[PDB]
Amino acid sequence: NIIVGYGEWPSYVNRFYTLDTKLWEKSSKGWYWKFPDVLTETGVFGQNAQFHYLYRSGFCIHVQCNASKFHQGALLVAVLPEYVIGGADGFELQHPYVLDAGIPISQLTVCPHQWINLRTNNCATIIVPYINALPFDSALNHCNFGLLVVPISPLDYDQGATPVIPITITLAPMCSEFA
């Protein structure tokens, strides 16, 4: 299903951007992306973000993964504003237990989140509004939030099945403004 972050819709280049595919392995630890840095060298949005002095936008995020009925595992997808760590290809987690910031992963469900259980569903959709202490900001000096995709239950399969599961991220800006 679709979850709307904090119960608020975005308000006052608007197309689908499909990123490169991640490969989920038996020993994967997790990945994260930062916004708007994920879209700053791709297309008209990236051209607009590097030539304007002020920026403001919301987002719509889809996470997908296709696997067979003989695979198993579970992922947690969450959005954390101002994710300070202690491009379009993302980064991997070194210590997923502390989320690389000294905070537990078990309480990450306090944020707008979704579950991907391979036996039940294979999609997750989150709608994020604009969050800041300022009406406008800079798209090249400040990252508003981060997206996390972490496996809570490890991927398992029998020998002879495909050993890597693809994860696809496609996102669309909503109510973007430039000045």
């Binding site: 490169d20 296709n66 067979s68 693809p166 696809t168």
Partner: protein, 49 residues
């Protein structure tokens, strides 16, 4: 190999829209994704996905 090409080989000028259909004939338990792209006249082939 199409009948449209053979039929327009009997004329000199033509113009209009076309449509292409792709059908997958794998097994019921196979999954994946593909990207099908169209490039307008005058442009080059994309270098990557």
């Amino acid at each position: 190999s199409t009948l449209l090409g053979q039929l327009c080989g009997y004329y000199t000028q033509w113009s209009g829209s076309l449509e292409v259909t792709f059908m997958f004939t794998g097994s019921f338990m196979a999954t994946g994704k593909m990207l099908i792209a169209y490039t307008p006249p005058g442009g080059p082939l994309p270098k990557d996905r």
